[PDB]
Amino acid sequence: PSPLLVGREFVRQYYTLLNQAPDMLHRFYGKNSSYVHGGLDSNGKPADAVYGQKEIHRKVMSQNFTNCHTKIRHVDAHATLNDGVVVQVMGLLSNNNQALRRFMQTFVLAPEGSVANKFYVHNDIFRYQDEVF
């Protein structure tokens, strides 16, 4: 369909879900899916992505998302390879009523193949600006 509308509706869904049920966030992904939600090493360098629904789940729960409140200030979305949709997102996130922090995020939504209008998140790249800059 319309890449703009697909990406706008996915972002709403993602951040609704991150708030209401983060234990089910992992359902957006598949076996090849890449995920990072910021963080950094013992060397102070940004944390590596993990892959697949199972590892993505173990990682979402280590973030201990509770009352995750998000303000989205930019969303764009565009047709990419194979009628996929790339989504750029900037906004602010507070988890557990902690600091309001700025983030830069990219998504790639890929058609699942089975039905019109069914996608999965092939890539989810989130970074907080305070960890990188």
Binding site: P1, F10, R27, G30, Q53, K54, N117, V121
Partner: peptide, 9 residues
């Protein structure tokens, strides 16, 4: 419309 959700694993 628009489904984004997949089966568990």
């Amino acid at each position: 419309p628009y489904n984004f959700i997949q089966d568990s694993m």
